[PDB]
């Protein structure tokens, strides 16, 4: 049975959330592959199927619980179980399709959405960009209930897509970027719910390119600059791994060392 990490929004603190994200990172990768001080997720080539996934069980005040499945090679949310039903994003290719049949094998009902979990499509379905979907403990609390009641018929599709956007950012992206974990910590500490600003969005949009630039860097320098936005949306370019070491927590395997 795949490793399970638990988190509850009920009585959640900055510390309980940080403990959660750190536990997720610890199950995504051994951390034995470190490039320029930044740990790398396992290479998909050579990774046996019984180590492909981790499970994140989320609970809230209503004692509703859902279990997200994360692919350890990229930390992304592949699908989730609620009760006797599992739901999966549409796979890109038949290899991803085969992998997810190893998830929630005893579940009674398995549903595959027609759409993938990419941000553009989710924002279309939710009817809102990430810039207009508030994040925080409250939103996560409401996302958990929405995911749960999808299986009973009480969650409509736009609400479901919004809830994925919230879960993916507060779990997957926070796992990938300690900056994003810091952004979620700040919201918890100031009892705030608020959408991500461009500094969060451009990081989320650039994880793969940042991981490539770092792993292919020489003497700390990128082959070509990567452009990000500040909080005010103004653009700036990163040329050096040193700027990103306090920002990125995990990289996808892009190259060998």
């Amino acid at each position, epitope marked *: 049975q795949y490793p399970i990490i638990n988190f509850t929004t009920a009585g959640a603190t900055v510390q309980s959330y940080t403990n959660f994200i750190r536990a997720v990172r610890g199950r995504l990768t051994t951390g034995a592959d470190v490039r320029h001080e930044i740990p790398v997720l396992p290479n998909r080539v050579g990774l046996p199927i019984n180590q492909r996934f981790i499970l994140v069980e989320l609970s809230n005040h209503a004692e509703l619980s859902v279990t997200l499945a994360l692919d350890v090679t990229n930390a*992304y949310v592949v699908g989730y179980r609620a009760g006797n039903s599992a739901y999966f994003f549409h796979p*890109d290719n038949q290899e991803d399709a085969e992998a997810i049949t190893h998830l929630f094998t005893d579940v009674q009902n398995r549903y595959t959405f027609a759409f993938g979990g*990419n*941000y553009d499509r989710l*924002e279309q379905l939710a009817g809102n960009l990430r810039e207009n979907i508030e994040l925080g403990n409250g939103p996560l609390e409401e996302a958990i209930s929405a995911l749960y009641y999808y299986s009973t018929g009480g969650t409509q599709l736009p609400t479901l897509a919004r809830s994925f956007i919230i879960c993916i950012q507060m779990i997957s992206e926070a796992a990938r970027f300690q900056y994003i974990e810091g952004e979620m910590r700040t919201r918890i500490r100031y009892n705030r719910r608020s959408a991500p600003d461009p500094s969060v969005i451009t990081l989320e949009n650039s*994880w793969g390119r940042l991981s490539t630039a770092i792993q292919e860097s020489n003497q700390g320098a990128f082959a070509s600059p990567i*452009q990000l936005q500040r909080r005010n949306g103004s*653009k700036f370019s990163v040329y050096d791994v040193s700027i990103l070491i306090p920002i990125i927590a995990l990289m996808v395997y892009r190259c060998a060392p």
Partner: nanobody
Amino acid sequence: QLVETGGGLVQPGGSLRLSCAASGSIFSINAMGWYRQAPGERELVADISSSGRINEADSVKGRFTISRDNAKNTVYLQMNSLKPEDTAVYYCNVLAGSHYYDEYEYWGQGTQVTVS
């Protein structure tokens, strides 16, 4: 899998319209956009998500207008009030991926734009 149209040489104040259509494995297609590089760095001109988010370089705000036809997986760039500083080779750019936003990246062949 990217077919670009457009490009040319204009005088200051002239206008060009670029287009680039994507075909193939673009189930999880995300943001399409345009980069430019002049001789001697490559810079983002504009991109647009399928959901309506637009990024644009300050240099071209109010002059260039990017738009997208999601059914055709095609992005257009209406370049009006062109200036000599807009001279460069322009590339369309296509991001895609279910697992993360920029998992897949495809570059166009580049078309020359010159203003003088």
